From a paper:
Specific recognition and elimination of tumors and/or pathogen-infected cells by cytolytic CD8+ T lymphocytes (CTLs) critically relies on the presentation of antigenic peptides by MHC class I molecules (MHC-I) at the cell surface. The overall structures of the complexes are very similar to each other and display the classical configuration for MHC-I/peptide complexes with both epitopes bound within the peptide binding cleft.
Indeed, the decamer GP92 employs p5N and p10I as main anchor residues for binding to H-2Db. The other main anchor residue p5N forms two hydrogen bonds with the H-2Db residue Q97, and an additional hydrogen bond with the H-2Db residue Q70. The side chain of residue p10I fits well within the hydrophobic F-pocket of H-2Db composed by residues W73, L81, L95, F116, I124 and W147. Its main chain atoms also form an intricate network of hydrogen bonds with the H-2Db residues S77, N80, Y84, T143 and K146. In contrast to GP392, the GP92 epitope is not modified at position 5, but instead at position 4, causing peptide binding to be largely unaffected by glycosylation or de-glycosylation.
Residue numbers in the entry:
A (entry chain B): 1 to 99
B (entry chain A): 1 to 276
C (entry chain P): 1 to 10
Amino acid sequence: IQKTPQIQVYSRHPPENGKPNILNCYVTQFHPPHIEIQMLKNGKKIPKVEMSDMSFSKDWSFYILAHTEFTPTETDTYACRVKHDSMAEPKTVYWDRDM
Amino acid sequence: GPHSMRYFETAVSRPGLEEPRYISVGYVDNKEFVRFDSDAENPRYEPRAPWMEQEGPEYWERETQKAKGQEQWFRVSLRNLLGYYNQSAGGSHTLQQMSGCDLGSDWRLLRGYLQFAYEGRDYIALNEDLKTWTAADMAAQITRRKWEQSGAAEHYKAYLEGECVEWLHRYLKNGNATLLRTDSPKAHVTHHPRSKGEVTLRCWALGFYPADITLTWQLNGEELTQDMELVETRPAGDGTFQKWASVVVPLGKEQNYTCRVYHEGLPEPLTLRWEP
Amino acid sequence: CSANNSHHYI
């Protein structure tokens, strides 16, 4: 088989509307190591997204941190779209500032 | 505390005339101190920790030549595994290795480790004796028989007991305080009123290192696993981690419920309740 | 100090 990726989207620092911050998308427990990760502000792709190097866990599964600078607002939505061989269609996870 | 060294190696193949990608990562006490990636413009082992800058050019040249050795070894083994599993050409295939040593707090060898996986599934492993192998699949049994005739376990046991341990001693001296960092969590409870007279109490631990942490909710002295939700620990990106665990409770009763945060950097566990 | 799997192939 392939292992279905787990996705969390969250800010590095406590969310404050209007205050600059960092947005993370942490993808874990996927196999094979190839994966596609996009970060979206208002459904549009954020240009320069930093991506941690390929690493895997003792259970042999792989994980990645993607992150970008962002300023949270009340009107702007952020999300992480992920394409992987284990899933039929891409999965999008929206940021929830309470989680 | 105890100590560890590991090398996590991966070879991933691609259909075509192009050779598989090889990546090797070293860890001392679960932190990445060196890395080799064959996709880099100039493939070499590079330091991922500041204290590895103490190592001289000879070290880096030796370790890079080793890595190109492993690279070749992995491409051969990849081809053989395509044979063993009767897979045709044009798949995505991954072969991985974990090796290393565990030392106790006396810096004395606790355990050696060698394991292999194919397609992310256990393939073969050296037993903690270091003389014998457990082979999961039928294809792996061929490899086991072949490695018993070739004296592989003697080879790896010499590496894991001698060089692994002695080099780990060196890296432990040089990364001395740095590998011992701890950052205590900061905890707080957030109040989320919900339908039907209840509230979600969510317990947050922020900014802690290392990543090991435990969060418990307690009603009247008993730990609560009933309807307790949590997230897998996540990196903040700054070198620290985050977690939260939540429990659904009756509104107005909040002071009846308590969160506790267990982390090694603490003097004692944190006990906290929702504070208005 | 990284590994050498020498001549023992899978």
